[PDB]
Design a protein around this ligand. Structure first.
Ligand SMILES: Cc1[nH]c(-c2cc(N)ccc2Cl)c2c1C(=O)CC=CC2
Length: 127
């Protein structure tokens, strides 16, 4: 029923790069999803204590959220864009795994994911 420590957003021994694809993931994908009307449940880790969801982290073992993604992009945490894409996809998957189908929270995840796929469809060419 307690909250776990959040996902790591800084690892100085982890090699990093500043690429046009990673810049796109911040300037376009993260910003588009962040300003969305349905973004707010995904802007920070699930607070299982205040939400009284004691089984959330019993079930969700790779928690992920756009607050964590944002910090990772700002801290230049990633080596490539696929890592960051995987974080987004894990956050959507967590929501679909934990919640019942037809829940409003699932509809919010779906709306954000639709936009996500639209932006990733036009990921720029490297270099
Ligand atoms: C992704 C998510 N965000 C949130 C959420 C997270 C914070 N921190 C605040 C308010 C909400 Cl709705 C939830 C969820 C769930 O999946 C579980 C159902 C409701 C809680």
């Amino acid at each position: 029923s307690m909250n776990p420590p959040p996902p790591e957003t800084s690892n100085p021994n982890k090699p990093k790069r500043q690429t046009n694809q990673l810049q796109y993931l911040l300037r376009v994908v993260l910003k588009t999803l962040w300003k969305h009307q349905f973004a707010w449940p995904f802007q920070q880790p699930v607070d299982a204590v205040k939400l009284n969801l004691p089984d959330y982290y019993k079930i969700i073992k790779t928690p992920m959220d756009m607050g964590t993604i944002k910090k990772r992009l700002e801290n230049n945490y990633y080596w490539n864009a696929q890592e960051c894409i995987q974080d987004f996809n894990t956050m959507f998957t967590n929501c679909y795994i934990y919640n019942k189908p037809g829940d409003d929270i699932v509809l919010m995840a779906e709306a954000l994911e639709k936009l996500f796929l639209q932006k990733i469809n036009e990921l720029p060419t490297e270099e």
